Symmetry: D2
Subunit: 322 residues, 4 copies
């Protein structure tokens, strides 16, 4: 075989993992390995997903695995391995930072498998608490700083954009709304940077298409979106938008698209941050994270951003304190 | 003043299959979606998740949730998945679609009343098991036209048959035509004689040694047991990825008048000599709903297998009657 | 008895752009296609070629040719490319869209009569040059509603602006929002101040050294001269690939009620202080046709540039009147 | 750049070449090099096609070239370089075999460029007379027998399928109708192998959905299709379906899809043919031509097929006699 299909390993074959495998089938994006420590269930999803290729009229291979040797040759590795909530806790108290002790362990294990079997892979971490877990995976795997990132802000931005799109009665394709910072309560929906095809939202507000109050409401809703879905589902957390967000990042790498997809990236001076990962605007292409966009934030925005940075810093402290 | 409106599909049942079909509509920008369910909370969670996905897909369709039938008014297509997947108390090895009859008939009759009242002009695709029995139940309780009601099943069974064969021949399943007809259960009939590779009979490939007769038989059996295998492996519920795409593919063939050959459970009026019942047969789906029902020249041997499928349906329909 | 019919688009003019738009409909299974033209023979050749492509695309839409207006009856969208691309006798360097006025006005008035009689409920996208003048001509001669008639141009000009910027920043044009407004000619206005990278002002990238102010100016000029450059390089006719996709993208936004921001030539009723004329402005296209016309807060300097664009349109519309 | 985009070189930037570049833009299939001996026009199409990526929201590079060094690194090379008709001849007398003396020269030139700059490419010849030109290119370039083929039968089959689809009122996706043999008057539309989702057409005819006469008519129309379009266009020949046919073949190779796409392939015993290329059912995947399907043809079909083979043999004679 002269021309081989791309290969994506889903480390974690739960709700997000299986849905990403499904997206690969629909788009014929890559062969899929549904990896998990659980036996049985991953093979069931592999059978279900592989059978979907017939109806999709596409041809990719979808298999399951519980041995890391199986992810060798993966071009991309997407990591969802982990818990979505603290066992026993009420949905009312769902908190992403509370997952630290349960998932750091898992991420370290995955990091060892990737370092050993597919160290040349582009890695997209999804597992919460996102920013802390990306740093945890990067430290343990030893992969290049431009080849490891965390999916979060594309999802946060997708919410921000959908809410704005509904208010303005315009497709979200034409709404550029971005959230940066940590994937949590202190995420920063950049209201000043919201545009309708590059036209500042401020011009729409002055024309009465949206009020300042509605905007503030949308910014708050964007922050609470994940928790609302957790409250409403009553079992697990979001997976359709998360899966598509991660796969869009994976595709940008595989096809060297050079898309602006805000995600948790390694900092070395950007926004004055060092030795850590946090959500920032970035361009993803065949060279992995090709550009980290440094915006001219206002004093007010910097204040908000420093709060987001502090949450990551303290979480990274607790991580180390283990 | 909207002159050109989007198509609208109501997912009656917002569980695994319903939520996944909503996702497909978002990805393909196929139509606005209403995730209907008796359960409140969960469907709104999925509508939020699915609507947020439109931003990443760069598409624009409306995804909302509902627990009131008035909300499905104006639906062009209704896809029904409302129902139980497993019977409480049965082991996974004991899983049998027929046992769902008493639980789901009640549900399907309730849905029929809702569709009859709010969107009687819709094309209806039933998914709820036991499939052939539930499609008939929906049809008589709703009163919709015979060409506007069908059951998704054989497209999924055929997808399995095709994928297994594709794997063995090292050919894309796009180029494998393998069809299963009959009831969606142990007596389904994977038509080995009609399997082709771009119209070339599979038998020529077997004679050339590409694969064996024994492997074909193994695949025929694997196709029948596929659903139960996924139930066993998943440990919870049943298949949903291929089932969702099978139904959405049928919905799209109707919505865009594609005239696709998609085997499904259809109203019989003489075909293969059957009357007043629904059973899986090859059919053409277009803007006219079920536009053609293909009646294959089955051999005596294939007829014997098909007859068992028919007897199974007749038996469930009698059980349905006894309620 | 087809309950769900396919959308229908009539391509009035079956030349380079018309045939390519028909091809796009086949690839996306967007709608049935009628390739209309005064020329007989050629359009049937293209309908044959385009319909045969459905087999390979595995799609199913009808592509036919016509030279009688009765054939466009029932069209949901009409895209008009009927007209000359170059004036016989002019060198390629002398190519100017304004010179096409006398040749094309006659053609557009004939098309207007056909649409008015056979499919007055259609959404109409004019492509024929000189664009802004031809859209106005079509509108008054046809009598269609102001929100149902527009001209494709700025989506193409913007595509050029976006591609040039994308190349310099090494970012997909999906993430470059660059817009051109005004008349589709030398005085078009590429809005340098409104160029963004996913909503982030281009000026921040320039300050960071990603590209220079000088390169931006070069790109602004290149955007204005783009059509003439393709005319010069092709040696025959003019651009058709990007023009076809620009118009089909507008058609799809209408057909599927997407509500996309697609700058195009729209009827002015006060915006930017203009009345009784069509000119390129940012607009939202949905199932209601032109649903919104965006009025940007232009600076005095940008207004001066925009005013020249307006004067050019006013001048052609006067020339049109003098016929 | 860790992950690079696939690259396709269009040797010939005329109607088919430019349209294939357009398909690459729409599907984001690969970077495109529009090559030609003509300067000016290819750059115009490159500008037009590259500008279309903005509207398509895709990102591939489309450039033009007139120097072969420019096609280095091409994964696939699609060759349309050549004349579509004999200069001066009436459309009534259009004949594919008449192009031999004009295009053999061109193909030999292309063969030298490919051998020198991208010998590892999968090559799809489109230039007429197809079967003769594929053999001409293969002999001159020295490329592997499984990496060179000619696009023709996918197009012939597309016509056969569309005509049947229209009669039966079924999507052509569900009509499997295949033409094999030489791309010319003696091509062989395999009526006995026509199926509706694997169901023999014969069953439909007996049910009165199509008559034996209509079938015969469709077989004849399939043979004359190319000439009808030449007659009707009055300028050049078909390009929309040809372009999509060739790109579908290229994609099957690039994404290792393993599609059954009848095309002109190298024979070494199949159908008892040796040292020559002719249209046959074949599977295209990442290994190029992975399978050549050998059908159990009837005596009547063999007769017809031998006539198709003879046309290729004599054309290959004339080629040599130069
Ligand atoms: N960053 C984001 O935007 C975002 C959004 C949603 C969810 N998430 C997070 O993504 C993760 C996955 O969510 P989900 O809904 O798919 O969860 P899920 O519970 O459905 O699946 C997690 C899967 O990982 C598996 N797993 C556990 N330990 C493992 C190990 N050592 N190796 C391999 N697999 C292992 C589990 O068996 C399970 O199959 C959670 O941490 C969740 O909080 C992140
Ligand atoms: N025909 C086929 O090929 C095929 C394949 C797989 C599954 N199925 C069947 O499809 C059905 C759905 O499977 P699933 O995985 O989505 O199940 P699921 O358990 O995930 O969801 C079924 C949903 O229907 C809802 N429901 C119950 N009663 C309802 C009522 N009166 N009105 C509206 N909604 C109601 C439930 O609350 C639940 O959300 C099952 O009956 C299953 O056996 C059929
Ligand atoms: N607005 C834009 O952005 C833009 C971009 C490119 C080209 N254009 C213009 O679009 C038009 C079409 O360009 P093209 O490349 O398709 O040209 P073309 O020469 O290939 O085709 C124009 C077609 O219209 C036909 N025609 C002439 N009179 C007609 C009539 N009365 N009724 C029906 N058809 C008639 C011609 O026979 C021909 O087939 C030109 O006027 C060109 O300048 C506009
Ligand atoms: N096999 C099939 O099914 C099929 C179908 C249709 C057309 N064709 C054939 O495909 C070929 C191309 O058709 P088209 O419509 O694109 O033609 P076209 O006339 O539009 O373009 C042919 C192009 O090749 C160029 N060319 C000539 N000599 C060259 C050389 N030495 N190097 C590089 N480029 C050179 C020409 O300059 C021109 O741009 C013809 O031979 C035609 O008969 C084959
Ligand atoms: O992280 C999450 O679970 C979310 O935001 O959906
Ligand atoms: O009916 C089922 O559950 C199946 O076949 O997957
Ligand atoms: O109008 C034109 O011809 C252009 O811009 O391509
Ligand atoms: O070869 C040709 O020109 C054809 O068949 O279209």
């Amino acid at each position: 075989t002269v021309s081989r299909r791309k290969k994506i390993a889903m480390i974690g074959s739960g709700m997000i993992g299986g849905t990403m495998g499904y997206l690969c089938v629909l788009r014929e994006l890559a062969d899929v390995v549904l990896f998990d420590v659980v036996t049985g269930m991953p093979e069931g999803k592999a059978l279900d997903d592989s059978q979907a290729t017939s109806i999709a009229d596409t041809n990719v291979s979808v298999t399951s695995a519980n041995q890391y040797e199986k992810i060798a040759g993966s071009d991309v590795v997407i990591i969802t391995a982990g818990l979505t909530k603290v066992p026993g806790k009420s949905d009312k108290e769902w908190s992403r930072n509370d997952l630290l002790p349960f998932n750091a362990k898992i991420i370290r294990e995955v990091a060892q498998g990737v370092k050993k079997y597919c160290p040349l892979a582009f890695v997209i971490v999804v597992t919460n608490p996102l920013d802390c877990m990306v740093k945890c995976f990067h430290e343990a795997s030893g992969l290049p700083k431009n080849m490891v990132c965390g999916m979060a802000n594309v999802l946060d931005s997708a919410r921000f954009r959908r809410f704005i799109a509904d208010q303005l009665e315009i497709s979200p394709r034409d709404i550029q709304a971005t959230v940066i910072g940590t994937h949590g309560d202190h995420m920063l929906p950049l209201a000043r940077y919201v545009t309708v095809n590059g036209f500042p939202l401020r011009e729409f507000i002055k024309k009465g298409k949206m009020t300042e109050a509605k905007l503030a409401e949308i910014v708050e809703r964007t922050k609470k979106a994940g928790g609302e879905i957790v409250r409403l589902l009553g079992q697990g957390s979001a997976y359709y938008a998360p899966a598509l967000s991660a796969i869009t990042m994976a595709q940008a790498f595989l096809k060297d698209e050079k898309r602006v997809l805000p995600c948790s990236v390694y900092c070395q001076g950007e926004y004055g941050l060092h030795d850590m990962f946090i959500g920032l605007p970035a361009v993803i292409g065949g060279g992995g994270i090709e550009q980290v966009i440094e915006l001219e934030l206002t004093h007010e925005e910097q204040e908000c951003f420093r709060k987001s940075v502090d949450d990551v810093v303290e979480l990274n402290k607790s991580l180390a304190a283990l």
